[PDB]
Design a protein around this motif. Structure first.
Motif: not given
Ligand SMILES: Cc1cc2nc3c(=O)[nH]c(=O)nc-3n(C[C@H](O)[C@H](O)[C@H](O)COP(=O)(O)O)c2cc1C
Ligand SMILES: Cc1cc2nc3c(=O)[nH]c(=O)nc-3n(C[C@H](O)[C@H](O)[C@H](O)COP(=O)(O)O)c2cc1C
Lengths: 174, 175
Positions: A10, A105, A109, A113, A116, B36-37, B105-106, B108-109, B112-113, B155
């Motif tokens: 990706r 949180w 999340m 997700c 993405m 992931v991003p 937070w970005e 952590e995001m 999670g992704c 996470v």
């Protein structure tokens, strides 16, 4: 394309042009967004589709946010011109339940997700895009434009349209 | 497997058994996580593979955390038995940079992704799993076992194995 090929390779694309995903292409992207993991099935997201005159309305909001944030001449015009970097933008708001068994949180999340997942669904149909944020996600003017309550959070501005592996350092064995 | 069909039909599986993904199947899952991003390419994650004897070490850590959290007999034993619901667990830690241009937070995001991307890579290869958390992600004992600094965060506990076994109208708005 192949699912494993997309997951392993990706890549995002920041230079986007017409055509954007429309119709069932856009519907498939939004379907991918609502299929993300979701603790206790809270569905804690809202997806704001920004296109056409909505792009200019989004532009006026970002410009008004950059002015209120104290930007200079460079920052205000960049903010005004930011939405015009793609034919389509999807803004994802984490629509959170406060004081729930599920912490905020985890709901955030799920919304992240979704960003993405939607970008992947764009790539799978021959499009691409980039997950953007920046300081304007915290602007009070931008948040009220997207109906953000105190417990809500803008997790991404997903720009979308037509563009123009060794994990050893991160892996540990418990 | 078709990419779009997986994205539109994605489902988790909680009833998981041997075989776990191993070899290049496991490596492919970890490759998906690292793709992931990631704002400014900080790579803010660590993937802890939990299998074999590691599952027993994870069991003792979770049991310790349940005791220290004040759980009763049922909750302590449930924590001890929690890892044995799958042959494989991947714990994801957001390895965050504080006072960076990229807010925590970005980062952590991004971690999670990585959980979801790894879960989709499991599905793509004929496995499945479930993203789990619970109160023990905040346990001091559990965090230390996963080498969490104050700015780091667990996470997800991603259980993986061989499974045994949409209308977006209410959420979409037009700006
Ligand atoms: C951050 C996060 C944490 C989650 N934690 C749990 C959990 O602890 N226990 C659980 O049953 N589901 C948890 N879920 C939800 C499951 O991963 C899964 O999404 C849920 O069982 C719905 O199944 P589905 O993915 O097939 O729609 C969590 C989801 C997220 C995003
Ligand atoms: C939560 C989050 C916010 C992000 N915000 C930005 C951003 O504001 N600007 C930007 O250029 N990239 C941002 N990124 C990173 C891009 O989405 C993208 O991952 C990056 O440009 C590298 O591209 P790649 O996905 O091909 O690796 C963000 C990523 C995440 C996870």
């Amino acid at each position: 394309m192949d699912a494993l090929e997309l997951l392993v390779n990706r890549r995002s694309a920041s230079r986007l042009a017409e055509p954007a995903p429309v119709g069932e292409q856009l519907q498939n992207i939004l379907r991918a967004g609502m299929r993300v993991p979701d603790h206790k099935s809270l569905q804690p997201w809202r997806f704001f589709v920004i296109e056409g005159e909505g792009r200019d309305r989004f532009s006026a909001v970002l410009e008004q946010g950059a002015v209120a944030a104290g930007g200079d001449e460079k920052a205000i015009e960049k903010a005004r011109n930011a939405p015009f970097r793609a034919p389509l933008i999807i803004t994802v708001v984490a629509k959170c339940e406060e004081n729930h068994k599920v912490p905020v949180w985890e709901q955030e999340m799920s919304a992240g997700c979704a960003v993405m997942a939607m970008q992947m669904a764009a790539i799978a149909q021959g499009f691409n895009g980039i997950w953007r944020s920046g300081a304007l996600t915290e602007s009070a003017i931008v948040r009220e434009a997207f109906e953000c309550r105190p417990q809500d959070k803008i997790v991404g501005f997903l720009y979308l349209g037509t563009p123009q592996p060794d994990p050893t350092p991160f892996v540990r064995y418990f």
